[PDB]
């Protein structure tokens, strides 16, 4: 089972993580049944 928990928080701090409490709600459970040992973030470029 792949559990994805998530939380959206409105912050106004410029640089670091804000200090506070926010419990993450469960968003989606995925029936994947596969081995996962590595991950990578996906970003977006800006072209002009």
């Amino acid at each position: 089972y792949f559990k994805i928990y998530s939380k959206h928080t409105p912050i106004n701090l410029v640089r670091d993580l804000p200090q506070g409490f926010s419990a993450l709600e469960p968003l989606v459970d995925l029936p994947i049944g596969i081995n996962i040992t590595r991950f990578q973030t996906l970003l977006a470029l800006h072209r002009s």
């Binding site: 089972y1 029936p31 994947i32 049944g33 596969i34």
Partner: protein
């Protein structure tokens, strides 16, 4: 395949369903049958397992 052929020569569409169980979580499940909800009585409830 001609329409006037015998039943042993007429075309037959065949679909074979193969059921396997693997160590991955089983997700093709049969219908979850439900019955009407009855309130205010001592009943045996089965809610989502």
């Amino acid at each position: 395949f001609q329409p006037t052929n015998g039943v042993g020569y007429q075309p037959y569409r065949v679909v074979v369903l193969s059921f396997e169980l693997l160590h991955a979580p089983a997700t093709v499940c049969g219908p979850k049958k439900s019955t009407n909800l009855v309130k205010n009585k001592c009943v045996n409830f089965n809610f989502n397992g």
